[PDB]
């Protein structure tokens, strides 16, 4: 309270950011402390939920939908003037149910990487890569090698013509709409598989294999991110970085990830953070300071991005990001990765046709939750089936009780049958006795009248 | 408190008993009230369990084991001198776990009933009845007709040679030992079934059909109890009552039931009841008074029984009771009746052979509780199976969480691979730079010594 | 014996009630202790049956049918001067076989709740909701959201047009006359399915979802009880509470639950209990003390309901209640919840049609008497349980397979990372050797220009 | 209370064990019943936990770790004079958290079985088998065939060279110390895979196939337990039973199973059950009675094992016991059978390598198959639950049947009683008619002597 504590990961320019913190400390008297604690993404939900930890946290936007789901983040309110300082599409990476929940900072995305010496004019279209490889193979090189084991890297081509992870309409994801076996994704994947079939790529090619091959000049092109540049730098291949090839006319569609600054729902300093982010960090001065300590890569702030774009590699990254699909910030996306990962490997390794591989994603992406659903139906079915067991229990105590009554009743009734039957005749003979006596009285009176009348 | 209230059923000599109550009231000043309330056997366990109702209750001994099981009855303490005033075997009808729990009063049991005019010398053995019937059939009569639908009436012959309900050893019943399919019972039943096969009896003969037949002089003999006498009296058949026929040398073994006076565990007047029963009711005077109001039939009190025996019918009853099997006072006896009932009907109607009918009694006797036992195992199985459902529930939350870690870890590791690799070569070239500088220093020093030494 | 122990659930205002019991302890001198034992509805039948437990017991009236039937509850005898102080229908929920068995205290019913900033004038008919949802979906919001899983919530709509559970005749229900697939219920349920068919609602909308949706202003309307308000109060949505819409001109027919106060059959303090309720609790001052501790919602006492109904919400709940269905206090009702819970899902997800889904309800409801049937219904339940444990089993097996493949990648990278670190750290020691070596060689040369020579 | 009930699976010599109980019933007087309820292992945890079921339970020792963990078993306390009568290592299979929880009775392990007319001298090492299969294939016969599908069989070879499931430490298992991809396991599985690669075995050889092969003389050898012998006896192949062959000079490590006798935790007969096992069963005479009914195989008792070992086969099984792995009595072990089962298939059919397959077995303990196991234990529990419900259903149907017959009597009687009441009441009014008719006629006659005349 009265000061701002901020968490950013250790692989970012925290000192650079502290500098911005000091400029703020000077101008308002508010001391800003910047920290990079160990695995802070895991640490965040634990300290925010007891009014502790950072007033503001910098992280990949995808972890944030999980935090907003637990109401951990403050809703942010930037006037539209400020909203037009950043790229439209970056805001879409920081919404949850229509509420804006964090400030976009950086933008990251795969790009085509190529050896200028081997290939000074990288191709624009996937379609021409086969022919290009047949050429380079004749001088002991390959056209392209990139990580096929993972979907993050194979998606761009697959999504190109029509795929999508989850439909997005109004700042909201329909988690039941999955565009992974639409005719477009099938075309994407077929092509990719066909490249393997026609021995232009190896299905067992992963990250390290690709990286090594490019760095040793064994392949003309590869696909990869800004995280990889300082590595390729020191191979001293002469490498170009540029727009991903199109497919069937359409841009490749690589997933996009966005370093974002979010504010703690718990924090009291909500407006002093809003200030710090809006007026000190998200400016050319502020981003430049962080950039000096460690490059951010392509940024969300239009004005400063336009400066960094001198570096064509940073130009490419953003060009690709703007043609790509923001990576959905919803819990279920990890099911997507899981499912899609297995889908592709199978499709590639021959284990499945594209069609069956992609058709199963629809089933498998929910195998997690359908099974969990069956566990909870079964939970209820046992409550019911326990009730029925009570019912049977008293059914048996009942039957046992009403057996005794039947056995005893059989005999009661026998005694009664004899009682009322003996009581019967006894009353009868009494009455039948009264009759003979009256019969005799009437006989005796009648006999007298005859005497007297005669 | 200070007085005795006593409950007896309405079909007994309650006025007779009140007279005994008045003799007591005179001699000790204690007013005794005698009551016959509606279904008092059902009413007893409800009033005794809140210190209410009668100080003493007269009822059929079999209901009393159920009462003692609920500790409702006081344990009685009659010195051995008093014990020898009643017939030994009667006391066995009033034990529960070795504790004497009531005073025996009256004894009831089936006897052979026969038409003196049709058959002045009733047979002594079941074995001679077929022949007898062939004789009497030739003059339009039957030898024997008695209630075959119920086991209480068919048992005497079945048990004759070896059967028993539940084994009885030390004032205790082994509820797992049931002698209903031992070779003896098989012989008894076979005979009975054979009588039906050889058209000496009808399988569909019940109590009313038997009674009618005997009372109209259509049959020479029947089997029945004292409850039935006053009924037969008024048919004015000239009837004898005597020992049941033997089978295979052995006496018939009819069940025996004993009117017994029990004392409330709750009652404070335990020693004033002991008194009343021991010294006023269980004497010749006392029983005689009750007898005047309503005959008890054969009694437990040796001395007075020996008087009543002048009536040979009452002699037979007791002779048959002493050769019979006290009717077990344990809850499970109603399963016995249920099982054995169905056994015999089936055996008689052709629906089953004797052997299979009797073998099933062993199973069916416990359908009852074996089935209840399954309901309660199943009750526990559900508690367990609900626990496992919790386990599966967290198994799924787990798996879903550790999919997110895996997806994020795949990428963390990719970045790290590039970080530590670029960091790698940067340290290497620094060191490799220090090397050339030292290489050049040493060269320059070495070039000097050569100059100077030369 | 001269002391009043009262049971009332924990989530009620028991410190309030405690205050009423002290105002009573004052004006008479009889100590009153209130408790709130866990699972006290299920404790009561065990404690009452041994003369122990409470003189008065507070609970939702439907449980009191179970108690009455076991003869655990005393018949209350209030004058018609008193009876008129409460709303006529609150007596209909405390009747068993004509007899009044408990005192009504509070009344509860779903009501239609709405966000005024998103919808200032709530609709008066169900039929206008689709039209209204379209309007709202246009600006990325939904019309209505409320727990579809549970029948308790769906019923109001279904039973609206002349539907009902069991016919209430005089003071009981005919257990075999049922309004579940009469004209009314079919039409209603048809409409509920249409809303899901036409995408206006999701088939798997539960309580937890529907609360969060409304309470964060995603949806214009929900359906819910007084229990759900304080959670809205904290969310600060500007909400209103009103009459549930009409369907076919008829009011929605939500269930009514009426907190009743019953009296133990064999309680020593008969008139004293009556006295407390009639003259101390069921008065403006008693109910207030309670209400101040925890809100009872609408109350049965006219005098005080007119005070509380100044709160348009409490007035609304009571309106819906008068327009709604009392919960039958008969055992048979517990098949209703199950039969209708599955009927809903089956008609919704399309596994059955509306006619056949309500015909199976019709059947399972009417009638019991269960016992052996219960056991066969378990037999079929466990086939269903088996299917689900199957589904859960292949759910895990699928996730496990796909989890196996992310782990393939993860160990691969971890491998390469560990390898990279090994290679690098060895290369570094190789160089640091070269350096220490050269440093020595130079030390010699150097130390031998300085000495030998200059 | 003064009686001993025992459970033992049906395929065991229970009529023999009964003979041991009669020798026990004679010399003391305590009756001892032996039963063999279906699915009794699953039954026991539900019957123990309601003070029902058996005093002692006979089963494979692995199931007893589950029971011990729930506290259902009594800790046995035998003197070291007794302990020494049994082979040291049998007591390692009846320990849970250091405590002895049952008596060892019999020992079972896989042995090497061979056909002497095809191979008079069986090999002493796995390594010579390919060499020997070549020799045999030449004359159209295979060296070895046994169940490759099941790990229980394939384990012996895999575990040979220092492999193990979980480390046994003192009296427990370090649940996290696992020998499944140590140096030993890999080498063994590798050999098993090679045998399949080089066409010495078929990948899809299961039990059924292997038996029929060996039993019809198509293969020189098979691997199997005592249970398969009697089937060979009949086929009449001339067969020997011997130690399993060594791998890398190490004895094969087949799973040992010890049939053990456990005692119910809350059994009224504590010292009596101990008395029966220690002094009557675990003795030459006792074990003989049981072995005469059905062979027990190896026995834990020294005195009688040296007798049975005159059968070379039995000595052979004992030798492979001692040289084998006692089954861990811990829940976690069920993951093993699965993980490994797949591991073996995968490594065999080539879908994984030996290294990566055994690493996946290494991991699946703990992690994801927490939940999946619980689902599958639910899956088997419902099978027990279905048997229970079955038992209840025929319990009801039985009593229903017998109830129906008692009612038959009851209604017949009530009919007769109602007929008798009718018949008589029409008589009594008939007479009362006459009596008032006669009175009137008399009144006239009489009134007409008094007036007319005198």
Swiss-Prot record, chains A, B, C, D:
Keywords: Periplasm, Signal, Sugar transport, Transport. Induction: Induced by maltose and the transcriptional regulator MalT. Permanently repressed by cold shock in a PNPase-dependent fashion. InterPro entries: Maltose/Cyclodextrin-bd, SBP, SBP_1_CS. PANTHER family: MALTOSE-BINDING PERIPLASMIC PROTEIN (PTHR30061), MALTOSE_MALTODEXTRIN-BINDING PERIPLASMIC PROTEIN (PTHR30061:SF50). GO terms for biological process: carbohydrate transport; cell chemotaxis; detection of maltose stimulus; DNA damage response; maltodextrin transmembrane transport; maltose transport. GO terms for cellular component: ATP-binding cassette (ABC) transporter complex; ATP-binding cassette (ABC) transporter complex, substrate-binding subunit-containing; maltose transport complex; membrane; outer membrane-bounded periplasmic space; periplasmic space. Belongs to the bacterial solute-binding protein 1 family. Its main location: periplasm. CDD domains: PBP2_MBP (cd13656). This is Maltose/maltodextrin-binding periplasmic protein. The keyword Signal applies. GO terms for molecular function: carbohydrate transmembrane transporter activity; maltose binding. SUPFAM superfamilies: Periplasmic binding protein-like II. The gene is malE. Part of the ABC transporter complex MalEFGK involved in maltose/maltodextrin import. Binds maltose and higher maltodextrins such as maltotriose. It is found in: Periplasm.
